[PDB]
Amino acid sequence: NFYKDSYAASASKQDFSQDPSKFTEPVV
Amino acid sequence: NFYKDSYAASASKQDFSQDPSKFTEPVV
Amino acid sequence: NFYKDSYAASASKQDFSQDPSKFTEPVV
Amino acid sequence: RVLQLKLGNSAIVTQEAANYCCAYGEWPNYLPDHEAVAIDKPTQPETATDRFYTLKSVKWETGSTGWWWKLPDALNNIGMFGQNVQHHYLYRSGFLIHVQCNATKFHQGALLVVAIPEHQRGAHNTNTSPGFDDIMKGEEGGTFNHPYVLDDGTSLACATIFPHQWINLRTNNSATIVLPWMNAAPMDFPLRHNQWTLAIIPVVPLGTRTTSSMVPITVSIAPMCCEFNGLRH
Amino acid sequence: IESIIKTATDTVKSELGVVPSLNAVETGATSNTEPEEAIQTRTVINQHGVSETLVENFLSRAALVSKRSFEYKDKNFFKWTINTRSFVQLRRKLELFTYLRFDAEITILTTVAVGLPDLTLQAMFVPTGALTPEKQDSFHWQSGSNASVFFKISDPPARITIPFMCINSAYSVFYDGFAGFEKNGLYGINPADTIGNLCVRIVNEHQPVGFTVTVRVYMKPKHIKAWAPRPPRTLPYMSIANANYKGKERAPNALSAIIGNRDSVKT
Amino acid sequence: IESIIKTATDTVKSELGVVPSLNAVETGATSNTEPEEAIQTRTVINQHGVSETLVENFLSRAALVSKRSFEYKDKNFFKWTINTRSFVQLRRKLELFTYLRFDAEITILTTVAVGLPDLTLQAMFVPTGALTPEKQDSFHWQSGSNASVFFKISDPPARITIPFMCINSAYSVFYDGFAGFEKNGLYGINPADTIGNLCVRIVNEHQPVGFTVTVRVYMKPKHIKAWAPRPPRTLPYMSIANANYKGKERAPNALSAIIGNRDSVKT
Amino acid sequence: GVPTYLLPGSGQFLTTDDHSSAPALPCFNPTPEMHIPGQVRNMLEVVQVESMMEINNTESAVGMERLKVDISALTDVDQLLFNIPLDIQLDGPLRNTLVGNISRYYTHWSGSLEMTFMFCGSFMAAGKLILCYTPPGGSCPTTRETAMLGTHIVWDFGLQSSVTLIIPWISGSHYRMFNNNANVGYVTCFMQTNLIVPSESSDTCSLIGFIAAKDDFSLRLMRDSPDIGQHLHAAEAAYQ
Amino acid sequence: GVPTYLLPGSGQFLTTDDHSSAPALPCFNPTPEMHIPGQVRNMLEVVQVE
Amino acid sequence: GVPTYLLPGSGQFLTTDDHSSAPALPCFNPTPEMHIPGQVRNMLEVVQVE
Incomplete structure (x- = not known):
């Protein structure tokens, strides 16, 4: 990215942080 | 900027230094 | 390579690691 | 293993069911300071509105399609919650839905207690959008017209992706869903927008040898962590 | 407990x-009895990457969201209100979520149908809360505030990133509620979620051309976040605005029967 | 014992x-009696690089794998199932291996035969397990999932790298076996090894043009690995699918005689 | 004065590229993020979740009846109640699921499935069932005496209202391929015993089965979905 | 010999861009700044006023 | 604003080039390699054989 804005950048395909539990086990 | 002149550069959107007081309180 | 993927890169002409023995001498 | 939820002045005799559903794994809390928008100090009732508003018992016969209540549309007249909804410009409140069904050991049946966020309903077969008196129902609460597609063209078969429970009349008799504030805005309008939709659909219908069998379903909503801004009057 | 799962x-x-x-x-x-516990297993080091099921990779594809031809000699240009609800392939893929937060990315791609002329185009993005041009040559086209973009035909296609425009934190995909505050305001429309109005005209003054300009607008949304997934819509659509459902006369994807039948359950 | 041999x-x-x-x-x-041992020799420091006999260098050349002309006024476009078995020069060079693992690299190169028009093309790659467009203008062309690519004529040719597509670790070049599980499934076809279906159309609406578009698809496979080399095929081919052999009527490369004859063995 | 030259593939528009483009609104301050519950950061989080199977995908089952299998007293001992083919490619009981409808955006799939069958009779209603898992390749069994061999689970009603059943991932290839197939597997269910209700409970008990993908599940090579695709009201109204 | 290629959106004129362009007058010595009172550096300074 | 200029031989297709091109399928997870016996890494391994 050489643009001054941040949303102008390429896509961020790095959000590997899952949390499958919050749908399968939404309990307490 | 790769031009030798300085005004040829991109815009400088970094002047965040406000002073609202000099219009609202121009008193002594 | 400036692409995010790895197969998009140029060819890797660096695999000089031969093993001629495994065809000429496949014995034990 | 009999139990008594005491919240506010209201109190419900319940069964201890395992695993009280905190929807999407979150207990509801107040609006944090770094996410607020309205600069004025919001009113936070702690026992006036935080109480079990129990709606009418609804007759589950052997041919019912389901029941749906929209929150807080069901509670826009009831109690001190309706004395703030109709006196504030904004609200923010999670909910704690306790759906209890009263069967014998002989009745068969199965219920899907599910809380659909932003259940934008659909009208069957017509290109006219659903009217204002077709979405907002109040304490009465509507009835599904085509529950198999959740009245919006989606599928009930996939509807367990939402926060859901089960009332299987063998295993249990009560459901409990605890709801956080699900919205794209920190606060929203209490007469223009329904966040959730408590949907109770009979998957397996009711049955015993007397074919006139009816079982009532009790539904009780308590708002958790109420907030309100913009007090008129 | 969140954990990185590569x-x-x-x-x-x-x-x-x-x-x-x-x-x-x-x-x-959901029952979490392991394959270890219920049946016999063995050691498997698993190397299948989950990356293509990411919510970024699942939606950041440049789907064609508009294909509008206009005749040059609205007439003489087109204005287009931005929605992803145009084509049913992308919409069902977006109706898998309740709240979506993305930065859009428009790519206007221009052709000329019937010596083929070289022209200069203008693709002005007018966000909602401003004035869109009614005529082809209003003074709204040289509005120096609106983020216009000039591009030829014989060049690579023009491409601009439009940021996250909503005043809420996410676009409400579905909206159980009513726009405004009066009882005739329609159901399922949020005024906050409106992107803008992209409008494209041909800059040149009127040429004796017997040619048709077919314009294609693409959108690869990016920096995508998602919230509260939904059951995918099985029935055929009935409009762009409301989620009305009709069903087909026969299975599959009918009102009575979403799945196509067979002889019996035991056959 | 593997050793780097530069x-x-x-x-x-x-x-x-x-x-x-x-x-x-x-x-x-293979007898490894050295030239040292069997005959007289001398000290030779050898500086001939083996690099051009590498399996990378032996196959990573952009061979023309398709040359399909279509007439614009399947008709109006072409779809092409990807195989290297099209032309016999590249195939025999690939029939020197049993299992091949490579990342392909397509380069579509477009000309216009009979003021020559400037057009925009679309080269959509439809992998197998999806829908290819039957008509020139189906809704399959704006399928936002398939990796389409738009390119003009007057520009450098379009170029995309297609990854290793197979569900096995290598493309079975030969396949001693049968596709599927039923006895009419053909011999020597692996369903796993199918690359995809590249299809190219001209984007423009119908122009009074009396012109022919000749399209050439190139493929320089890269990141190549190879396994189990084979004897090179000497006989002329009989099809693309099966390895049937016919032979020629005279030597060389005949069934009875691969090598051309001489008078006698002692003459 | 940098000496450059254009490669082939210059000036192309590749509809799957990823390149930083020019912003429309400069120094646009976006609306700040706010912690909305239930963020999906990977679609396998959705596929992990249970959802219902239409086991009764037949004619003479309409709407909600297509989800449940009715066990009467007319169904005798060792009668096949249902078979569920494990072809998520084929348009059968697994398509209208979370695991089905998200996998159809993907050509190649791997990983293990997981069924769970809930019994919805009366409390007093007791009786046995045998859920046998046929692997890929093996044909569907027709008798309990054949179903007693493979991978069965003898389940009793009065003792247990739900049975988890693992479909293990068995394949010679690292994935399967969705066609534009032959026995990914089967689960069948036989009446091990009769159905026994007392003289007041309903003599027609019902089952509903679920399916969820397990934690080893994985998907690649994104296609477009076969389901949707086509009149659209107010479609031209965005322009006019 | 740098190997480059053009992206889409090459050669466009975006009327809100911010790119360093070519100067007209080279080594132009501009008239030096002089402290004029009441410099507005943000328009919310104006909106703050009654 | 990098000042560039095109060399001769720009925009040519040389059918023996070696340049990193654009990928078709982004973040495509390829099928992982598996040790198949008898890997040829140089064709003189074949020529060495009787």
């Missing part, structure tokens, strides 16, 4: 006459 | 009346 999970091996206890579905819990 | 091997010098012992071919062993 590959699909591994399988430990398993071990006679063991006695497991119990299960519960009715609490709303 | 140049061809060196020759040590050699030394009267020496007595070497024995040999064995019948164990399957």
